[PDB]
């Protein structure tokens, strides 16, 4: 099959998005490649909202391969809610041509969340089991038609924020140090696996006795149960903000703990600079709580440190130290 290389651009450690082309001839869009959702949608000319008015909108009337389906597609992103209509058209992702791709066409994207986002739409990369009805995930179509050299994709998130890259159908060793460690997915919906523990100085701080975690490029932060996050914020020296955020005085970075993740018997540390986001005047914690007793989300904070591999053929996750 083929290997596609899709260079990611980040909008401040929060949104990693790249380029795709839709229709014949090609209309270009910027999309969030999302390991936490399975649908594909872009804004359409039938979308009237301020947010649609501020992004690239698909004009089906200019595409010769466009074919309405009419089925409804409802989505959630952040505090946001999007409504659209399913169609078919041809997707172009670098090398790869994906011909009768199910695609959401927005009609409503009310509220600021979308207006201010830097991408146009989202291209979901989770399991088909997470897709909306009538929707076939992009990667599945590429796997069905054998468009990829291998049924895996790789994410390299440049901490330095320059060379981020999405690789379809290949692993590149020049993106990590050491060896690749393979963790089996427990639940095939999200890219879910088992975290053994979360330690600070050989002392278990969170995730006592193991926990379920998901690798999510769609999320900026590291998200966990509120009780556990509180332990982490105290222990790293973070205080609640008048915005509701957790501020950390920059420069105090040298005295802060290293937070360690034990995955499948191996250690995955986050240093204070990695878990800490420093912009303009402040230092903020990459740690975020979720109202109450769940599953952790390993968002961009984690993936910036660990080249991640998503293997649909073996239902495995591969992690290596990002260079």
Curated annotation (Swiss-Prot):
Record note on quaternary structure: Monomer.
Keyword Cell division in annotation: no
Q: Spell out the protein name for this chain.
A: Chymosin
Cystine pairs: 47-52, 207-211, 250-283
Q: Which residues form the active site?
A: 34, 216
Keywords per UniProt: Aspartyl protease, Digestion, Disulfide bond, Hydrolase, Protease, Signal, Zymogen
Tell me, what is one Gene Ontology molecular-function annotation carried by this entry? Answer: aspartic-type endopeptidase activity
Query: What is the enzyme's class at the highest EC level?
Result: hydrolase
The organism sits in which domain of life? Eukaryota
Q: Name one GO biological process term.
A: digestion
Q: Does the keyword Methyltransferase apply?
A: no
**What does this gene product do?**
Chymosin is synthesized in the mucosa of the abomasum (fourth stomach) of young (unweaned) ruminants. The enzyme hydrolyzes casein to paracasein.
Q: What is its EC number?
A: 3.4.23.4
Q: What is the effect of changing residue 283 to S?
A: Propeptide is not cleaved
User: Which family is it part of?
Assistant: Belongs to the peptidase A1 family.
User: Where is each Peptidase A1 domain found?
Assistant: 16-320
| Swiss-Prot/TrEMBL catalytic activity | Broad specificity similar to that of pepsin A. Clots milk by cleavage of a single 104-Ser-Phe-|-Met-Ala-107 bond in kappa-chain of casein
Q: Which residues of the full protein are shown?
A: 59 to 381 of 381
Task: Provide the species name.
Answer: Bos taurus (Bovine)
């Amino acid at each position: 099959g083929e290997v596609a290389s899709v260079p990611l651009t980040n909008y401040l450690d929060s949104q990693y998005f790249g380029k795709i082309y839709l229709g014949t001839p090609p209309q270009e869009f910027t999309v969030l490649f999302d390991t936490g959702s399975s649908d594909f949608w872009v804004p359409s000319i039938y979308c009237k909202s301020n947010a649609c008015k501020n992004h690239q909108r698909f004009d089906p009337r200019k595409s010769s391969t466009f074919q309405n389906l009419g089925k409804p597609l409802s989505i959630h992103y952040g505090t946001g809610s999007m409504q659209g209509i399913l169609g078919y058209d041809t997707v172009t992702v670098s090398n790869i041509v994906d011909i009768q791709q199910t695609v959401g066409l927005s009609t409503q994207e009310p509220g600021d969340v979308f207006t201010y986002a830097e991408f146009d739409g989202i291209l979901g990369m989770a399991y088909p089991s997470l897709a909306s009805e009538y929707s076939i995930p992009v990667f599945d179509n590429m796997m069905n038609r054998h468009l990829v050299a291998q049924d895996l994709f790789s994410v390299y998130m440049d901490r330095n924020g320059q060379e981020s890259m999405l690789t379809l159908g290949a692993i590149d060793p020049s993106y990590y140090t050491g060896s690749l460690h393979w963790v089996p997915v427990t639940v095939q919906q999200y890219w879910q696996f088992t975290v053994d523990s979360v330690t600070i100085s050989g002392v278990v701080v969170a995730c006592e006795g193991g926990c379920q975690a998901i690798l999510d490029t769609g999320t900026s932060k590291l998200v966990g149960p509120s009780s556990d996050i509180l332990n982490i914020q105290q222990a790293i020296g973070a205080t609640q903000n008048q915005y509701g955020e957790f501020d950390i005085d920059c420069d105090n970075l040298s005295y802060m703990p290293t937070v360690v993740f034990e995955i499948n018997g191996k250690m995955y540390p986050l240093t204070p600079s990695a878990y800490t986001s420093q912009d303009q005047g402040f230092c903020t914690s990459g740690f975020q709580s979720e109202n109450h007793s769940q599953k952790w989300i390993l968002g961009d904070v984690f993936i910036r440190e660990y080249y991640s591999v998503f293997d649909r053929a073996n239902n495995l996750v591969g992690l290596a130290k990002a260079i």
